[PDB]
Amino acid sequence: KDSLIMFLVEIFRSLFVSNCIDKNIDNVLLSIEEMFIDHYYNPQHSRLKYLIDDVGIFFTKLPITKAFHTYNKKYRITKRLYAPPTFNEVRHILNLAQILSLEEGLDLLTFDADETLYPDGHDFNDEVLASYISCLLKKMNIAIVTAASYNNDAEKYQKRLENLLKYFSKHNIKDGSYKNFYVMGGESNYLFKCNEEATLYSVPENEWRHYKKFVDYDTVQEILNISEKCLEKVIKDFGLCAQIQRKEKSIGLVPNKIPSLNIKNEQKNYMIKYEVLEEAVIRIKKEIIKNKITAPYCAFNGGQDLWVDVGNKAEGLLILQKLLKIQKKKCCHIGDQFLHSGNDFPTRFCSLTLWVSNPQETKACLKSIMHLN
Amino acid sequence: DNIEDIPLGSSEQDPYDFFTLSDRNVMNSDMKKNIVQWNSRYSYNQLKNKDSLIMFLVEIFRSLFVSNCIDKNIDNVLLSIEEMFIDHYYNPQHSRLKYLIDDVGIFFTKLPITKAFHTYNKKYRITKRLYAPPTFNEVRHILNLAQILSLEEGLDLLTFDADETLYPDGHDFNDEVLASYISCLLKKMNIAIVTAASYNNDAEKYQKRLENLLKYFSKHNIKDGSYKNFYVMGGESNYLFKCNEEATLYSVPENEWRHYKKFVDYDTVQEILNISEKCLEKVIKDFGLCAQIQRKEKSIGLVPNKINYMIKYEVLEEAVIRIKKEIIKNKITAPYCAFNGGQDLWVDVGNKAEGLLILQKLLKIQKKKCCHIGDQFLHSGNDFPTRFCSLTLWVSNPQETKACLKSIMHLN
Amino acid sequence: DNIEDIPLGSSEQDPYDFFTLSDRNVMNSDMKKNIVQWNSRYSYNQLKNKDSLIMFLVEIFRSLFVSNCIDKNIDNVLLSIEEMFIDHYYNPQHSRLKYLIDDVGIFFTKLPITKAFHTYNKKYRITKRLYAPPTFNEVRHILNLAQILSLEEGLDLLTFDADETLYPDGHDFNDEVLASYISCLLKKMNIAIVTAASYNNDAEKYQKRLENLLKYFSKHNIKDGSYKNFYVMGGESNYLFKCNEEATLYSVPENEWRHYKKFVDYDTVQEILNISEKCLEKVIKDFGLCAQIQRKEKSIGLVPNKINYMIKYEVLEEAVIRIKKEIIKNKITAPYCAFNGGQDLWVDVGNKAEGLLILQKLLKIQKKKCCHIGDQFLHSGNDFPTRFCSLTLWVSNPQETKACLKSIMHLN
Amino acid sequence: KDSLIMFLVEIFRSLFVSNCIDKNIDNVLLSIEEMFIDHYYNPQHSRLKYLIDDVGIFFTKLPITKAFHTYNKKYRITKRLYAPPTFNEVRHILNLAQILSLEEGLDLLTFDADETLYPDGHDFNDEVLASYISCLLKKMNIAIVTAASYNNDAEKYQKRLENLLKYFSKHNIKDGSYKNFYVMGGESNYLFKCNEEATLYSVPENEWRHYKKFVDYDTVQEILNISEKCLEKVIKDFGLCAQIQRKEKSIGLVPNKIPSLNIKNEQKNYMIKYEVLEEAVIRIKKEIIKNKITAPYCAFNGGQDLWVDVGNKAEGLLILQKLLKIQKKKCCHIGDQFLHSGNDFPTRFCSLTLWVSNPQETKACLKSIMHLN
């Protein structure tokens, strides 16, 4: 799951079953906060490292006590006699705590666009969410990391973000704010910026090529050929109706449309069992590790088709960090961890990370970002 | 055979959920739901509680897979499990399968679980997976296949949990392809619809949700008198409707079916609603909720206010347990159902198991010839006991309901 | 208040143990027993089943320790737990503590758990441990301290599970230091001994095990008539003996105490023994065991043959469950106890909870003024319900029994 | 616990609940055996490595199927309708499987003397067990690893093994078998052999010094001083009545005798809570790791007193292996894993290891060693 959330959940459970969760529990909260701050400083030798081995690194001193006190007044979770705090609520607590930790401020806010901004299969379609990103764009750089691989063609990427770009053109671009907006395609392969006319344009590759570690063209082609052989073997033994699609630095297994239960004349994408997709992801990672590949890559499920890309969203996050000359403490990222189950590419060590189950919680977290100043 | 002797425990609580997998607000698309079932710590206890028999088979197949022998001749293990299943069919009480699992229920047919496994495996080749063992969704598909293949003789009654399968996300019936399967099945066998919605005795309100479906019924079914076999049940076991010549529901006279339902002195009914109303009012005050209470004749509910204002899922669970505890505190033995919906809370003085038995006794159908289409993710086990009333099939989405009904259509 | 309404479930089974921590053959010295309690996967489910209330406190203190606040002012958590304990003392049925734990039982005294924690911590400084949280053995010591400190008014009855505490490894009583504590306590309060051994109505055989203890009784206690308060109970609740002028046991007349025990038609008693004897004979044949069956008037047992030939512990567990299942198959409702000893198997048509209540009613003692010294590792929960009859203390070895009795000696 | 045992236990449980455990289950057993042999060959890339990460290395092809079939006829564990196979029984199965795996034979048999041979606090006192070691001594070298630290004084070590040495003198030493017997004191610090007169004598340190990796005298003294400071701090805050005892290369915390509950005039060793001893072991390991000590050492509980020695029983096992010029496949060790809870010194990778809860199971395992030839 996520060992840190389970740590706080189990503590709150045991505090609840003692029938003292609604009294003054500041001694427990302050002790947990002092332990969290003691992991902020001297992280490798903190006591939290022994209690939880996969804490990672904390880049800010979060006020978990003040965050709990603030959230509890809003939802009154301590008043419930029969329902103790849940996994979802503790996730909300740590989200508010991470926002409150950034007292000095941040300059880079990144969104895993596949997970939070647009609902998969459609374009940006949230007028209120565009307004929150709008006012925040003025104060800080906002970057968008998207897994779509359209090479460096900015028109295809604009089709998904057209509504937000139209909002930019109407209200943001007036006072030079528009320069702060950045978009990252592929995983770390294509970069796009915004212009005065509110239209996406690809940044020259030579400007940001030096920041990223080079990956040999022979090595990536080796990766795609391995993935092609595995996907072909997986289609053969499961008798699937899918095909392998190869991009410049991307390869995926996409289902073929077939006539289905709709009578006479209609189509539906061939449903591939989610279990078969996970089996394929494990086979691909097993074969890639067998060939001793050090180059970073990401093989993810993400819906009904499987895709293997070179580079990970963490690499694009660190690219934007090093390019904009921002320290790691002053940048945060909004992304959903339910979609990436096994991780191995989680950015908990690259930048601050927020967990937001649906676009409505994104509005709530972005409202808190507005209130922070 | 009777609701009085059937085990309910309406005022019990399933062990608490900290991960809130039932929260269909956070879980959104089916992709995120399927991720958590792979991780055992995320969903184990919640899962097995919904259907322990399936989990029992998951553990056997898991050990078969990790022994690296799941793809060899495993017919000895499967035949042994089938032999336990048949021995539980012949002698359900005090069987050995009953000893292993207390809540296994009753089997009404000889389950050919071996053939169901061989056929399901041959179609999807799930045994070829070297790194992913068979998951919970696939063994529940096998149990569906085993129950369909078991049902060799035929059916007379088909029942649908209408809130779960027929209505998309609370909307009205809007699946024309599904109507064709339902119409062809009504021609051959009786079709019963049980829905938790309580619209008093207003037949037009119940028809409004089934308006699209009844249009297909009037187009093709009205020709051969199959419409008489169609029945709808309101409340949970409180109101009964049949179909007339036109595509409109007409209420069955109360005197015709009154005796089949277990008697409730009615004074207790409104005592239940008064306790629930006081608890919900206190819950609204305590959490400052923006909601309204809708009270029916024998039903009461807590519904969010129109913008819909969001009610915290955990507050809904808190209020359900408060109502059950306060109902115990007044020592009320009447069978009822207080369930936690996605956005709404509802307390009904009926149970869908009670209405299923009422439909069985009215139509004078034996239990072997009765089946039920229902999703076991949403309904708690204490409110509706699984496989105690009839054969039970599990369907997660309208597509699997289509496939099950198509397979039932080609029966024998 | 009565054995008839008390919850037994004599024919139930505790969830199976794969690690066999109860196997005192493999576990040998107390060092190896203490190792496994630190690992949660080794002993969790088995432990909590023996005393869930203690485990409930372990989880709270575990979360307090991992919060790195167990050594700060934790009096708010402890006072809240104490407030739940007192609320469970006033209203045990339907209390909130009863909601958290179903098998908590009844409290007969206001537990000062806060003071018991503060005193136990101040003596051993268990809160100073930075890497090891408080274990199960230390919280069960605190519960012992909380129950002794709770008992403020005083005692009239003291009961010993003789098989567990008095006899060393099945030998006769051979602890002269313990006799002094027992003698001083008899002077002030009545002392009752319940032992599972069944020697028919032979008072000399029961005395042979207590011969060393009765020598001390005759030396110091006989002077002040305290010997009259001493009572011994054979079988499990079948035979009763008192003390006479000399250091010899004399049987209490049956007519004096017959009515207190729940009636058994006796014909069922021998039906139970016949079922058990047939099951044990089949078990001996099936596993080729070298053992003998000893049948008493109202007791029957399976005992290893003299060289002692070793009987596999798991075969003993298998035979216990076989006997319970076959007893159910004949639908026998009489309260009995079939327990799995270390080397022997025994089926008694009595229960130590039934005999404890018989001693309570005979001496006309209120439950608040009754206590029991017993080890909860050996006795299963279904046979002897914990804290349903009187206050219960947990003792692992003769040394802790000495310390508890010394603390009881200085009471008020 | 021990992940491998749990693997077999859970499989046997699921086989039992299917009500097929008494039928022909050779397909499951042979598949598990083939998987075990496939981890014997190419161990780093075996499928067992993925299913169980801590399998370690297997030095022989064990016949787990034949071992189960042999054991089942003896105890009829498949006939039990209500009790599935336990942790103890599966441990017995793997013991028999490891014995049967040594078809070619072994030349070195080692006993953790603290755990199996003598019951703690007493000397060797098993006439029948001495007979089994007697006949086995002729065919193979038998070594004894004991944690007692008496320097290189052979008289103190003979006091614990006097009964077995007397058995050696009467029946073994007649035909030159006595030369095979070896004893290892400390952990890997003192070595003893047997002579014609059946009396222990210390082997010269220079003969076997080269095989063991050298540990600086400054480093071991650093270890003992750290342990002395920790034990002193532990005695101070718990108010214990114990004292620190320092040997050449050993240091321990030993309880002080105090007058106890026995009236007037008697003594008893001060009881130290087992929880305090575990807390001290963790503190000592934490401080030693903080000072970056690479030298092998062992800090164990083992009763009522705590002892910290330099070197581990694994080092003595490998010393005797390299000294006697024996391949790892032809040597086994009999020791109990209940006493060493957290391990970190388990010899599952050094040699074959048997698990034997009491001296009676040692007699049973040594009878099987007799039957192997």
Residue numbers in the entry:
A (entry chain B), D (entry chain B): 59 to 431
B (entry chain A), C (entry chain A): 10 to 316, 327 to 431
Paper text:
These enzymes catalyze the dephosphorylation of ribo- and deoxyribonucleoside monophosphates to their corresponding nucleosides, and also exhibit, in certain cases phosphotransferase activity. Each subunit consists of four domains: an “N-Terminal Regulatory Domain” (NTRD, M1 to K59), an “OD” (D60 to T143), a HAD-like Catalytic Domain (CD, F144 to K270 and K371 to Q444) and a C2 cap domain13 (K271 to N370).
In the presence of ATP at pH 8, the activity was highly reduced. These observations confirm the role of H150 in ATP binding.
